[PDB]
Amino acid sequence: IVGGYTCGANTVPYQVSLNSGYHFCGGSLINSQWVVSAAHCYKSGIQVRLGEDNINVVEGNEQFISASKSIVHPSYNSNTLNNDIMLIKLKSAASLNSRVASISLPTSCASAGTQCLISGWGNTKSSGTSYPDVLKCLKAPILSDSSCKSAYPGQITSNMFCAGYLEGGKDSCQGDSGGPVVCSGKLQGIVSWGSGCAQKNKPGVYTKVCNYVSWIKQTIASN
Ligand SMILES: [Ca+2]
């Protein structure tokens, strides 16, 4: 997250860290044994880490649970990043409390102008690299489909939406991928891509979760 703020320990209870010996992506807990992330974050040997703040220090609220299976969206295109979404089932159900809790799925799509909370342990610099140990937060507005498409000609599909600013200075970044974009208490987006980080006229692009609700629910019901 570039230009964000320190969230505060466990103030984003649904935020998960995907660990394969190190943190490589974020994710969102949607129920006691399922996590939603980005398909481009796929890899084997995944351990889900819940209740995390500083990812390099055991602080007392962590729950480390290995994944039993990963399900990348049937139509995921890694070249265009269309349908950049995947589900991860936990080997054992997580213990849900106030510091570790699931986030509700949308009943309707979010609109341009709505403010959302984006979070993750990704890079905090637009130029150079600096990994935060604690969770960073960013409050940003959904941008119109028009400005999004104008910023990325021929690249934005109906399964994508931009959030942030055309001005730059504030955006999600490498390492935040797979993470949550929450608006009005609902998971509306997944950190997906963008050209660099927080650069002018290159806002963040997110997976439009509302389009996948049916698929998410159905998949869960049979797995
Ligand atoms: Ca920790």
Curated annotation (Swiss-Prot):
It catalyses: Preferential cleavage: Arg-|-Xaa, Lys-|-Xaa. Substrate binds at D171, S172, Q174, G175, S177. Its EC number is 3.4.21.4. InterPro entries: Peptidase_S1_PA, Peptidase_S1_PA_chymotrypsin, Peptidase_S1A, Serine_Proteases_S1, Trypsin_dom, TRYPSIN_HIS, TRYPSIN_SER. GO terms for cellular component: extracellular space; serine protease inhibitor complex. Subsequent cleavage after Lys-125 leads to alpha-trypsin. Further cleavage after Lys-170 yields pseudotrypsin. A cleavage may also occur after Arg-99. Its cofactor is Ca(2+). The keyword Hydrolase applies. Residues 1-221 form the Peptidase S1 domain. Disulfide bonds join C7-C137, C25-C41, C109-C210, C116-C183, C148-C162, C173-C197. GO terms for biological process: digestion; proteolysis. Keywords: Calcium, Digestion, Disulfide bond, Hydrolase, Metal-binding, Protease, Secreted, Serine protease, Signal, Zymogen. One of its GO terms (molecular function) is endopeptidase activity. Ca(2+) binds at E52, N54, V57, E62. Synthesized in the acinar cells of the pancreas. Is inhibited by scorpion cyclotide trypsin inhibitor TopI1. Binds 1 Ca(2+) ion per subunit. Interacts with SERPINA1. This is Serine protease 1. It comes from Bos taurus (Bovine). The gene is PRSS1.
